[PDB]
């Protein structure tokens, strides 16, 4: 893969690490009754995932133009993981906003 695609994939993986830490932070604050922290953290998480999704669509575009079927498949599965995490964060934020 091109170095521009590799750069994108490292940033995607870095932001997913941050997303997982934010999800755990949010769930912990919720359980301890810190709703203000849970809501703030869930919003930061949604923003982080939205950025992962943009970069993964960009990575996928670049891998398609490259004719790189291996990384096309990988970018497609990373995008799908990110969209699932986004759906989980949004539903958790909705639940927190009702509480």
Compute the CA torsion angle 29, 35, 36, 40 (nearest 10 deg).
60
Between CA 65 and CA 41 the distance in angstroms is: 36
Q: Of 99, 85, 77, 80, which is closest to residue 24 (Cα–Cα)?
A: 85
User: Could you tell me the two tokens for 1?
Assistant: 């893969």
Q: Measure CA 23 to chain center.
A: 10
CA–CA gap between residue 78 and residue 93 (Å, rounded): 22
Closest CA to 92 of 38, 48, 50: 38
Residue 90 · residue 49 · CB < 8 Å: no
30, two tokens: 């919720």
Q: Half-sphere exposure of residue 13, counting CA atoms within 13 Å on the CB side?
A: 6
* CA atoms within 13 Å, Cβ hemisphere of 48: 21
Contact (Cβ atoms closer than 8 angstroms) between residue 54 and residue 8: no
List % helix, strand, coil for the chain (3-state, nearest 5). 90, 0, 10
Domains and CATH numbers, the chain: 3-98 (1.20.58)
């Amino acid at each position: 893969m091109s170095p521009e695609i590799e750069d994108l994939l490292k940033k995607i993986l870095e932001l997913l690490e941050k997303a997982f830490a934010l999800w755990a932070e949010a769930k912990k604050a919720l359980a301890e009754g810190d709703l203000e922290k849970a809501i703030s953290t869930l919003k930061e998480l949604i923003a982080t995932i939205e950025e992962v999704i943009v970069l993964t669509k960009k990575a996928l575009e670049l891998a398609e133009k490259e004719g790189n079927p291996e990384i096309v498949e990988q970018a497609k599965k990373l995008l799908d993981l990110a969209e699932a995490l986004l759906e989980a964060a949004k539903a958790e934020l909705a639940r927190a906003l009702s509480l």
